[PDB]
Structure formats: structure tokens, C-alpha cells
């Protein structure tokens, strides 16, 4: 009941996936909305697409 | 009060007429799958003197 069903079966599939998605959402949406920053990101993306794509 | 009875208990025919309509639609769908009627090797049969279709 406690060790398997309530702890580890909850930890493997639903809790770990939820934690990963929450961390990724925080990382993605933690932007400060600075045009300089994301235009520099645009420049990096442009260079990567021009060079490492054949 | 007869109108009030009809005005309140007219919903009790919906399911029966739906059942009748479903039976009619089942027959109409069965009439579209008569490609092998009286043509199967197992049930091929000469028609009776007063008969045109083995089944409907």
C-alpha cells in the first residue's frame, strides 16, 4: 500500500513526468521579454540554420 | 384535459418510433448487400414456382 502503490508507482510515471514538464515550462516561460536578448537568440538561430544544415 | 395529456405525454412515442425507424433502416441497409443472394456455393438453390428472391 504505502511503499509501492502510494510512493514508488506514483513517483515513476506521473510525478516524475509532471516535475519534468513543470521545470521545462518554467525554463521556457521565464523570459524577461527583452528584444535585445531574443533578437540575439534569433541571430544565433540564423547562424546555426545557415551553417549546420545541408 | 386530453390536450394536456398529449401536451405532457407526447414524448413517450419518440423511442417507439425510433425503434421502428431503426428497423426500417436496417432492412434498407440489408437490401444493399444482395450481390451474392442465391449465389453462394452452400445455399445456391432453384427458385420456387412462386418466388423471386430467396431472402429480402
Amino acid at each position: 500500500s504505502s511503499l509501492l502503490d502510494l510512493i514508488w508507482l506514483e513517483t515513476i510515471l506521473p510525478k516524475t513526468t509532471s516535475f519534468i514538464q513543470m521545470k521545462m515550462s518554467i525554463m521556457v516561460s521565464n523570459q524577461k521579454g527583452l528584444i535585445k536578448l531574443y533578437f540575439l537568440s534569433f541571430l544565433i538561430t540564423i547562424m546555426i540554420s545557415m551553417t549546420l544544415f545541408n | 384535459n386530453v390536450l394536456q395529456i398529449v401536451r405532457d405525454h407526447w414524448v413517450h412515442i419518440l423511442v417507439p418510433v425510433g425503434f421502428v425507424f431503426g428497423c426500417y433502416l436496417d432492412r434498407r441497409s440489408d437490401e444493399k448487400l444482395t450481390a451474392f443472394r442465391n449465389k453462394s456455393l452452400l445455399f445456391k438453390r432453384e427458385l420456387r414456382p412462386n418466388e423471386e428472391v430467396t431472402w429480402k
Partner: protein, 347 residues
């Protein structure tokens, strides 16, 4: 803004998009893009405030950079081919530049930040028009130039768009930012299916436009821009909350609603071309979108949040303005799955 000026600007935006979609000349397509942006900026800046001004400035910068890149790609293609007709581009570098410019115009990752930024900055009608029309045009250009698209780059951008939209929608609370991330994810799906079947691309475009129109018009009807503002709608007009809930369910791809049809058709088309991993990952990633849709639906329809006292006066008064084609868009966004074979008509 004067009503005549407003309708003139709207017609100018529509005429620019129509010129883009009917022109066979790269110069004319670029002219249409320029006209569209020029007439679109005041629509964003209709309701004047610092946030709207900032959103318009960011949108102008992004669209101007994209237009410069697109014109550079056109010139490079002209250098090596001497052709102005919009066909399969004859230079890989020009094709890459054109693809990047069109992705920047659409909002595909990693060119996505301006989409939530501008959508939050501008009002509901401006966001609706922005999403719908400004994604309608570059998708037409991409469909015209589909046969030269680099599948690796296109699919990479599409998958990035799907993932970024899912995670952003997971973390956001503002309705307009949620809509922006939903738009990003759906554009990712469309561009993923683009290099294989432009008919499937157009079908996804139509379904997404219908669902987005329904959702935005419901939000305008309820006059809600945040989660808690929408949480009070059940105490004034519970029908709108239920319609919004079914629309949110449809946008999540749940069968047997209309939103499942684009995903289903795209999966079928991609798996026809011996592509399994990409459809599997795309299908699994939509669960994030469905999660934040369901979280939004909990606060508005399936539960009853606390209300206020002036809601009694709200009950006493009645909505006046009537939305155009709202019931039609609600029906078309939830009950057209049995009419799927019409994609042959769309072909």
C-alpha cells in the same frame, strides 16, 4: 479611430493578403507583405496604451527583419536563376533564407517570443485578427514553395514549436498568452505536415482558424482576459462557460470532436511516408496543450469559483452587442468529424 479609417485599414490588410495569395511575382508578394504590415500596425495600436505601443514596436521590428530576409532570399534566387516567378527555388541558400523569414513571420520556434508578447500587449480583436490573417498569408507562400522546403529544417522547427507551445501554455496564466502558445503549437503541427500534403496543411489551417475564432469570440462575449475574470462567468451566463468548455475540449484533439480530425489526418499522411517517430512524438506532446486546456476548463465550467456582490447588477443588465457567426463557429469547431472526407473538396 474613425470607423471609416478602421474599415479601410482592415480592407487594406485583407487586400495585401489577397495580393500575396494571388501574385505569381516575388516582388508583388513582397509588396503584399509590406502593405499587410503597414496597415496592420494601427490595428494593433487602436486602443492606445504603453503596452499596446510596445507590442506594436516589437511586431514592427520582427516583421521588418523578416521582410528584409525575404527580399534578400528573393535577390539571391534571382542571381542564380534570373527568375521572378514563385516556383521551386533554384538555390539552397536562398531557400533556407526564405524558410527562415517565413518561419519568423508565422511565429515558429525559435522565433516565437513576439507572439505571446504582442498577443498580451494587444486587445482581443487585435489578437484574433493577428493570429488568423498573419498566419493565413505566409502559410500560403510556404504551400506555393513547398516542393523546395528542406524537410530536416522544417520538421525541426515544427517540433520545436510544438514543444515550446506546450510548455509555455503549461506555465502561463493569461488567456491571451495561452492562446498565443496554442497558436504556436498548431502552427508547428501545420508546418510538420506541410512538406508532405499541403491539403492536410490547409485542412489544419481551416480547423484551427474556426476553433480560434470561436474561442476568441467567446472570450470577447464574456469580457474576460484572465483566469479569475473568466471564473466569474458561470454566475452570469453559464451557457457561455459550457460552450467554452466544449471548444477547449475540441482544441485539445479529444475525439469525437472536430479538433481530432487535423491530428488524425496529419498522423495518417506522415505515416504513409514511412515516418513514425515524428507522428508519435507530436501526438504525445499535445498532451501538454490538453493539460492546460483542461486546467482552464476547471476554473470556468466544471467548478464554481467564488463570485462578487455587483454580479447581481450584472444579472440585472443584459448583453447588447451580438457576435457574428458565433453559433456557426461553435458548431463547426465541435461537430464536423463525420464530414471528414470533404478534404477531397478542399484538395
Amino acid at each position: 479611430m474613425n470607423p471609416i479609417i478602421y474599415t479601410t485599414l482592415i480592407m487594406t490588410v485583407m487586400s495585401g493578403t489577397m495580393l500575396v495569395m494571388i501574385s505569381s511575382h516575388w516582388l508583388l508578394i513582397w509588396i503584399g507583405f509590406e502593405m499587410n504590415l503597414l496597415a496592420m500596425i494601427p490595428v494593433l495600436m487602436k486602443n492606445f496604451n504603453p503596452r499596446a505601443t510596445e507590442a506594436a514596436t516589437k511586431y514592427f521590428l520582427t516583421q521588418a527583419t523578416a521582410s528584409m530576409m525575404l527580399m534578400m532570399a528573393i535577390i539571391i534566387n534571382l542571381l542564380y536563376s534570373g527568375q521572378w516567378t514563385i516556383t521551386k527555388m533554384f538555390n539552397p541558400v536562398a531557400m533556407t533564407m526564405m524558410t527562415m523569414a517565413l518561419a519568423m513571420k508565422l511565429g515558429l520556434s525559435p522565433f516565437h517570443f513576439w507572439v505571446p508578447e504582442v498577443t498580451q500587449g494587444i486587445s482581443l480583436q487585435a489578437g484574433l485578427l493577428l493570429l488568423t490573417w498573419q498566419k493565413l498569408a505566409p502559410l500560403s507562400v510556404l504551400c506555393q514553395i513547398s516542393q523546395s522546403i528542406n524537410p530536416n529544417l522544417m520538421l525541426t522547427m515544427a517540433m520545436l514549436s510544438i514543444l515550446i507551445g506546450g510548455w509555455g501554455g503549461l506555465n502561463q496564466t493569461q488567456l491571451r498568452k495561452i492562446m498565443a502558445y496554442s497558436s504556436i503549437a498548431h502552427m508547428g503541427w501545420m508546418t510538420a505536415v506541410l512538406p508532405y500534403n499541403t491539403t492536410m496543411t490547409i485542412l489544419n489551417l481551416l480547423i484551427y482558424i474556426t476553433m480560434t475564432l470561436a474561442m476568441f469570440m467567446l472570450l470577447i462575449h464574456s469580457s474576460a482576459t484572465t483566469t479569475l475574470s473568466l471564473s466569474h462567468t458561470w454566475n452570469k451566463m453559464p451557457v457561455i462557460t459550457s460552450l467554452m468548455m466544449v471548444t477547449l475540449l475540441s482544441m485539445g484533439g479529444l475525439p469525437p470532436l472536430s479538433g481530432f480530425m487535423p491530428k488524425w489526418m496529419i498522423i495518417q499522411e506522415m505515416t504513409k511516408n514511412e515516418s513514425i517517430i515524428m507522428p508519435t512524438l507530436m501526438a504525445m506532446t499535445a498532451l501538454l496543450n490538453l493539460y492546460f486546456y483542461m486546467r482552464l476548463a476547471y476554473s470556468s465550467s466544471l467548478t464554481m469559483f467564488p463570485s462578487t456582490n455587483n454580479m447581481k447588477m450584472k444579472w440585472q443588465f443584459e448583453h447588447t452587442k451580438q457576435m457574428k457567426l458565433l453559433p456557426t463557429m461553435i458548431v463547426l469547431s465541435t461537430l464536423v468529424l463525420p464530414m471528414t472526407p470533404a478534404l477531397s473538396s478542399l484538395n
